[PDB]
Scaffold this active site. Structure first.
Site, mmCIF file in Angstrom:
data_model
loop_
_atom_site.group_PDB
_atom_site.id
_atom_site.type_symbol
_atom_site.label_atom_id
_atom_site.label_comp_id
_atom_site.label_asym_id
_atom_site.label_seq_id
_atom_site.Cartn_x
_atom_site.Cartn_y
_atom_site.Cartn_z
ATOM 1 C CB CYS A 1 -0.872 -0.017 0.856
ATOM 2 S SG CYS A 1 -2.349 -1.323 0.949
ATOM 3 C CG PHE B 1 -7.021 -5.933 0.225
ATOM 4 C CD1 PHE B 1 -6.796 -7.091 0.447
ATOM 5 C CD2 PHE B 1 -6.592 -4.345 -0.110
ATOM 6 C CE1 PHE B 1 -4.981 -6.371 1.379
ATOM 7 C CE2 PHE B 1 -5.268 -4.474 0.886
ATOM 8 C CZ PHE B 1 -4.463 -5.727 1.532
ATOM 9 C CG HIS C 1 -3.386 3.640 0.839
ATOM 10 N ND1 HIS C 1 -3.816 3.315 0.116
ATOM 11 C CD2 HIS C 1 -2.693 3.130 2.077
ATOM 12 C CE1 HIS C 1 -4.114 2.194 -0.460
ATOM 13 N NE2 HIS C 1 -3.686 1.160 1.193
ATOM 14 C CG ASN D 1 -6.279 -1.160 1.026
ATOM 15 O OD1 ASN D 1 -5.449 -0.619 -0.499
ATOM 16 N ND2 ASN D 1 -6.138 -1.500 1.662
#
Ligand SMILES: CC(C)(COP(=O)(O)OP(=O)(O)OC[C@H]1O[C@@H](n2cnc3c(N)ncnc32)[C@H](O)[C@@H]1OP(=O)(O)O)[C@@H](O)C(=O)NCCC(=O)NCCS
Lengths: 380, 380
Positions: B155, B206, B294, B327
């Site tokens: 990430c 994810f 992020h 994500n």
């Protein structure tokens, strides 16, 4: 913003290899015995022939009879073996690079706290956090070390790390880049099979080793000792070379697919690949340059030598590395550079590049990608 | 050697996501049905609660009910499944990046022949030749494109690609870097287990996506349109954060282990991590800066916001990206930058960074490594 003035310079080179020496003459005896393939008598003759013509005399391996006995799946052809291969590689790759890095830092003569960047390359397994983090932690580098982790780039990675280090060193004032390439064959160790002849080639060639370098622009006079200057860096995907060198990280481990046409594809295109850096330095004769070519195999060195009309002493440093350590993938070309400067200092040559001014660092791998760097040697 | 004068500038941003939309509200129903875990009722209630608090509304996936039925091993907990996960990832990762790159190149307005560098990042499987080669070939870029392939960096990779692109663009005249980050969850797909609660987090968070940027120094006026300027790039391994995010590429795929509190550790150290770039620009108020953090999960955005005393609109672009796509690992932060730019253009704001001058691109992952970039927006 103050940027440095000079080209990225190699300030130190350090190398390491595992302590277990395997002679190439009798490697087929060991290889067929640990993989329980003694009954494949005809395949052993084929592997003996390839090993006899490999130009390799010895190889250093982390893997022993003991470690292969404790992890039997690595000795099996298609059985699920990635887990024990990774457990060995993830630990040994940064450990081997640590010894190479310590030697490079000691040769450099400056504290490890001055290292601002870390470029690591390995094709020996993957992990999160990477081998770059593990090396940085093992050495005790600043927690703010800028990292470039190059996983699974194959045999051109020795050149890629220097290409990356070039831009990092030249664009950041005071930047001192620790470059590290470390290969441990735990993931590529393949049991011999009549269905994987290209796997016999890889088994005859691949060895373990690590190389580490300190790269930086604007060397501090009477403090740092410049070895080689990086003047140009680039690469090229060769035409009609699709699938020439393929590598897939599967459940059975890292499976290499090497077509027999690899040395021929490099030879046919090597002159065109070297065209751009040659014109940058006004086309010097090939025989007036030093050669740090990746010892991918003897056929690659023989055919580049023949195609370019090189005198036999040019490929010697590459052939000596191939003879003493085999194909250590990314690490190999940096071992060649170390051997070039060592021969030069030992023989009291005008330059660190065997007396010559300009030189090439050539790496090749998946693509087929040929990575090239134009280096200038330092007068001694 | 003439080096460029200006800072590395983002000249275009293009994004892509697979067409199959999975609503987060009913994702636990789909997830527990394809993995044959409908009997694990108490674990489903725990997963439903994680999905409800995830801040995610929808995620785009390449994996469907059809693809998972044709690849049963991916739906199993510990069964050997890396091979079919790789076959999907190796093909889909550069294909998704192609779509994002085409959109970036089209927004840039210059021919693809001017792309001299390619920086690719992915944590969705590995292959040799890499996803970088595959992307370059699919787009038809020059065979001499200088590549940096960043595998398994997690990430923070979205920030690493920009740090790498910064040095490549700033040290090479005329250099135009194609930055690409592409993530497909075929490798990270984990069947639910009461013995792997860390896997439930990854399963809820994810999603798939790709982002591509064109980075270059010295933009040619009335031809190229500057979006953001990169002024500083660096990273930090947080103290006492060993083993915070561990990712192992095993036979059963990519397994994640969270031994520490990731959002808590970043919040506690964020002031110290951001100290060096804030110093470079004379410590501007945090609320006078744009934030491209992020979107790893809702907790990280909430905890950075609370620790730094940020006004609720700062993390909005990051929250919008998390809400719409989840994500997407390396791609996420670049989607946030695009959203900050898009919001600015539709609201006719003074700058591309939501009216603010300076801003941060914060990526975090394995280490615990926090990668940070200081950007200046462009006046519009
Ligand atoms: C492999 C090598 C050492 C063999 O020595 P050589 O001088 O070429 O000797 P020959 O080519 O006459 O014999 C090679 C034998 O191995 C076979 N072989 C060589 N390369 C092969 C390949 N890539 N795949 C399958 N078989 C191969 C040859 O067909 C021959 O088999 P044989 O017993 O049926 O005749 C040499 O070809 C070489 O260095 N090749 C390049 C290896 C390479 O690509 N390395 C980089 C790996 S990333």
């Amino acid at each position: 913003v103050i940027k440095p003035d000079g080209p990225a310079t190699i300030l130190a080179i350090g190398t390491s290899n595992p302590t277990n020496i395997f002679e190439q003459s009798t490697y087929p005896d060991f290889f067929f015995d640990v993989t329980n393939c003694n009954d494949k008598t005809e395949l052993k003759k084929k592997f003996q022939r390839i090993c006899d013509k490999s130009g390799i005399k010895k190889r250093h391996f982390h893997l022993t009879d003991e470690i292969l006995r404790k992890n039997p799946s690595i000795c099996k052809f298609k059985e699920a073996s990635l887990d024990p291969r990774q457990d060995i590689a993830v630990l040994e790759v940064p450990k081997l690079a640590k010894e190479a890095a310590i030697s490079a830092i000691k040769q450099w003569g400056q504290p490890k706290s001055k290292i601002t960047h870390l470029v690591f390359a390995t094709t020996s397994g993957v992990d999160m956090p990477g081998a770059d983090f593990q090396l940085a932690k093992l050495l005790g580098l600043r927690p703010t070390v800028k990292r470039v982790m190059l996983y699974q780039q194959g045999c051109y990675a020795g050149a890629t790390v220097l290409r990356v280090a070039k831009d990092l060193a030249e664009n950041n004032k005071g930047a001192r880049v620790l470059v590290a390439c470390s290969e441990v064959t735990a993931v590529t160790f393949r049991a011999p099979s009549e269905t994987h002849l290209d796997g016999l080639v890889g088994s005859a060639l691949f060895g373990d080793g690590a190389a580490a370098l300190i790269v930086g622009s604007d060397p501090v006079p009477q403090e740092e000792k410049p070895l080689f200057e990086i003047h140009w860096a680039g690469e090229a995907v060769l035409p009609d070379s699709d699938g020439a060198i393929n590598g897939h990280l599967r459940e059975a481990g890292l499976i290499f697919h090497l077509l027999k046409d690899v040395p021929g594809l490099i030879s046919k295109n090597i002159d065109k690949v070297l065209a751009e850096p040659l014109e940058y330095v006004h086309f010097p004769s090939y025989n007036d340059m030093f050669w740090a070519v990746h010892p991918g195999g003897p056929a690659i060195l023989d055919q580049i030598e023949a195609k370019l009309g090189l005198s036999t002493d040019k490929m010697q440093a590459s052939r000596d590395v191939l003879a003493s350590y085999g194909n250590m993938s990314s690490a190999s070309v940096l071992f060649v550079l170390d051997q070039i400067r060592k021969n030069s200092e030992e023989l009291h040559l005008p330059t660190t590049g065997e007396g010559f001014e300009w030189g090439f660092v050539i790496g090749f791998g998946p693509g087929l990608t040929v990575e090239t760097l134009l280096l200038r040697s330092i007068n001694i």
